[PDB]
Amino acid sequence: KAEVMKEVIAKSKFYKQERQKAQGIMEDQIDNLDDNFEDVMSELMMTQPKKPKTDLDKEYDIKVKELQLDKRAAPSDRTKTEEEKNAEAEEKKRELEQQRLDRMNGMIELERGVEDLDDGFWENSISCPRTHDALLDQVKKLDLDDHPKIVKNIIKAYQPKLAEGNKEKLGKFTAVLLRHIIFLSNQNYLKNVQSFKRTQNALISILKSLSEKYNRELSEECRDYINEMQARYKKNHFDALSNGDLVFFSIIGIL
Amino acid sequence: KVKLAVLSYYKVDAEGKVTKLRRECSNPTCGAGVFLANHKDRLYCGKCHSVYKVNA
Amino acid sequence: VTIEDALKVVLRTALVHDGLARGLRESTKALTRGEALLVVLVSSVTEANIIKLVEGLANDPENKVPLIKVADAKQLGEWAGLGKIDREGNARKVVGASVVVVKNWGAETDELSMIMEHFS
Amino acid sequence: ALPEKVIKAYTTVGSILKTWTHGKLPKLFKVIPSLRNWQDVIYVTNPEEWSPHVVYEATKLFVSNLTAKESQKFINLILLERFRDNIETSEDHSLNYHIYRAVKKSLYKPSAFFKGFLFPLVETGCNVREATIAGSVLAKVSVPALHSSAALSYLLRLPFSPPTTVFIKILLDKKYALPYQTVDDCVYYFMRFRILSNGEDATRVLPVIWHKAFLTFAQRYKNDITQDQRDFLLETVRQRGHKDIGPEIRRELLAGASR
RNA sequence: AUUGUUGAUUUUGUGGGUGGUGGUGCAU
Ligand SMILES: [Zn+2]
């Protein structure tokens, strides 16, 4: 066996040097051909020769432009059977509930545990408004019932696909939208309770769709409100608290 | 990136006469309209990759 | 049939036979090679040097090529075929073309006779 | 004939190309596309002895530099022939990995590729294995919708052959925004297979690949056909429908809205 | 836009289907 191994290793080395030698001669001629390139190319240029489409080729070119003149159809995918859709929907529901049970029992998604967090804790045209005031200016002249219309348009006018950076703008708009929902609740609405009911829930529905895609921006704003409200409570106590603060906690439960 | 590089190649006088500021490649396949890039020591064709001396 | 309407079909017929040079670079290359049969140029070109260059080349004594005047580059680009078509059928995402030069007519049409007659 | 000094030089180059595997190609080789008589120069470099590595680098060089009309001849005379020869001569009838990349690089110029590789192949007795290998190359690399639609319109009008059906299926699978003229041609191609006066195509036996291609068109372009066309396609299914694929085609066609 | 001069073939942002020159047996 060992003798057979030594022969195999010897043969492999024997071929490797041959390939390397083959590569070595390979570069040598290529260098020679490069050196003799100018001499060769000159004679070719001295001997360069002096200066109808197939009917099939004619047809293909004709097809290309006529297809260009034509309108373009949209593509579609296969329709899943109702049983498949129900099976897929049931599977997604089963996965989501299982994750909820795990999170309930202490599963933390960085998949850590609550015990980990307890280390050292005790020892120590349409404009997209980047700020809440900007949204008010855009909706300043509109009626209360028109707010869902303008808010929805801003989302449509700045979808992610339309241009670069729209994700960030919509992300901030999610934070701005939340402050608007809380802001309206503070304002008096006993005069037009029906109108306020049609706008407040409608804006919440829009916020839910945004939160599905931009929970991170919403999460940052939500935590900021908690700190701001805490700071106001330190000074004014119950006078800081308002109806919107009750609304705000309700929205968090939804989203 | 270069903008309006074609404009730089040609100069138009007040009477509308057009003068070529760069030499054209002699390779027939390149033919006319193929212009040699002017380097310090050589003239280079972008189509044929041929090299010519500046004062040839 | 207006002259502008005549050019619309004429340019499209040139496209079907790959007979148009689109762009300043290809237009200049076509003219200097003697392959240019007709020149379409835009009046609203911001840089007058472009107008001077094509006018001088199109007016060279060796190869006198007819020249046409176009108000807007965008419509010339639409004739050049740069833009694409919608579900509605209207042109969208159209690209402005400052200069278009015809190399091959492709097919003889009455509209080609009219534009030549206008120049004569 | 070329100068006798040149033929020796390019004869030496051909020897290098026979066994070339990596590194830099000879400088004389790289300037062949510029030459007017590159067909003669390429002949002395003995292409059918080019190593698979050379074919790939050659395809990059010539497709980028040559004109559309000339790049066609390179694809048709060299790449296509080498593609066919390798499949025929290989023991397992597979295609070498480097040649497989060469076809992809030729596809960078869609006009030359379709009229130089695809149409000549299907029109010159293409076999099933050749179609499948080429179909995979067409399946993986991106082709423009406009050019792809023109090719699809081309294949649909050709006489029916299982090899041609494969290319028809691949283009449909790509999920292009087919122009409505192309969609009408797709309907007509499948329409001509229904029994009525008609040619043999009505009575010709249909492999599964035809049904799979017909299913794909139903799956993707059901919403882009007229109601009258939908009736004709349904008329085709009842007459020529497959045992298993036919019911699914009927489901997809009925689920679509008329344009 | 982009290729290596070239001309819309690409590049960018957002979505997004795909196991496939896959094997292995079975039934003319
Ligand atoms: Zn040259």
Curated annotation (Swiss-Prot), chain A:
Entry superkingdom: Eukaryota
Signal peptide: none
Record region (Disordered): 66-98
Location relative to the cell: Nucleus, Nucleolus
Subunit structure: Interacts with snoRNA U3. Interacts with EMG1, MPP10 and NOC4. Component of the ribosomal small subunit (SSU) processome composed of at least 40 protein subunits and snoRNA U3.
Membership in a protein family: Belongs to the NOP14 family.
Role noted for this protein: Involved in nucleolar processing of pre-18S ribosomal RNA. Has a role in the nuclear export of 40S pre-ribosomal subunit to the cytoplasm.
Protein's name according to its UniProt entry: Nucleolar complex protein 14
Organism whose genome encodes this protein: Saccharomyces cerevisiae (strain ATCC 204508 / S288c)
Gene: NOP14
Swiss-Prot record, chain B:
Compartments (UniProt record): Cytoplasm
Record-listed Phosphoserine modification sites: S26
Crosslink position(s): Glycyl lysine isopeptide (Lys-Gly) (interchain with G-Cter in ubiquitin): K11, K17
Zn finger residue spans: C4-type: 25-48
Signal peptide: none
Function recorded in the entry: Component of the ribosome, a large ribonucleoprotein complex responsible for the synthesis of proteins in the cell. The small ribosomal subunit (SSU) binds messenger RNAs (mRNAs) and translates the encoded message by selecting cognate aminoacyl-transfer RNA (tRNA) molecules. The large subunit (LSU) contains the ribosomal catalytic site termed the peptidyl transferase center (PTC), which catalyzes the formation of peptide bonds, thereby polymerizing the amino acids delivered by tRNAs into a polypeptide chain.
Assembly description: Component of the small ribosomal subunit (SSU). Mature yeast ribosomes consist of a small (40S) and a large (60S) subunit. The 40S small subunit contains 1 molecule of ribosomal RNA (18S rRNA) and 33 different proteins (encoded by 57 genes). The large 60S subunit contains 3 rRNA molecules (25S, 5.8S and 5S rRNA) and 46 different proteins (encoded by 81 genes).
Name of the protein this chain belongs to: Small ribosomal subunit protein eS31
Native source organism of the sequence: Saccharomyces cerevisiae (strain ATCC 204508 / S288c)
Curated annotation (Swiss-Prot), chain C:
Primary localization: cytoplasm
GO cellular component, one term: cytosol
Compartments in which it is found: Cytoplasm
Keywords: Cytoplasm, Isopeptide bond, Ribonucleoprotein, Ribosomal protein, Ubl conjugation
Keyword Ribosomal protein: yes
GO molecular function, one term: structural constituent of ribosome
Crosslink site: Glycyl lysine isopeptide (Lys-Gly) (interchain with G-Cter in ubiquitin): K64, K74, K93
Entry's family note: Belongs to the eukaryotic ribosomal protein eS12 family.
Function (record text): Component of the ribosome, a large ribonucleoprotein complex responsible for the synthesis of proteins in the cell. The small ribosomal subunit (SSU) binds messenger RNAs (mRNAs) and translates the encoded message by selecting cognate aminoacyl-transfer RNA (tRNA) molecules. The large subunit (LSU) contains the ribosomal catalytic site termed the peptidyl transferase center (PTC), which catalyzes the formation of peptide bonds, thereby polymerizing the amino acids delivered by tRNAs into a polypeptide chain.
Subunit structure: Component of the small ribosomal subunit (SSU). Mature yeast ribosomes consist of a small (40S) and a large (60S) subunit. The 40S small subunit contains 1 molecule of ribosomal RNA (18S rRNA) and 33 different proteins (encoded by 57 genes). The large 60S subunit contains 3 rRNA molecules (25S, 5.8S and 5S rRNA) and 46 different proteins (encoded by 81 genes).
Identification of the protein by name: Small ribosomal subunit protein eS12
Gene responsible for this protein: RPS12
Whole-protein coverage range: 22 to 141 of 143
From Swiss-Prot, chain D:
Disulfide bonds: none
Residues modified as Phosphoserine: S197
Predominant subcellular localization, coarse grouping: cytoplasm
CC terms in the record's Gene Ontology section: 90S preribosome; cytoplasm; nucleolus; nucleus; preribosome, small subunit precursor; small-subunit processome
A GO BP annotation: poly(A)+ mRNA export from nucleus
Domain of life (superkingdom): Eukaryota
Subcellular location(s) of the protein: Cytoplasm; Nucleus, Nucleolus
Family: Belongs to the bystin family.
Role of this protein: Required for normal export of the pre-40S particles from the nucleus to the cytoplasm. Its subcellular location and association with pre-40S subunit shifts from mixed cytoplasm/nucleus to all nuclear in RPS19 disruptions, suggesting it acts after the ribosomal protein.
Note: Present with 21600 molecules/cell in log phase SD medium.
Protein name per UniProt: Essential nuclear protein 1
Organism: Saccharomyces cerevisiae (strain ATCC 204508 / S288c) (Baker's yeast)
Residues of the full protein shown: 205 to 466 of 483
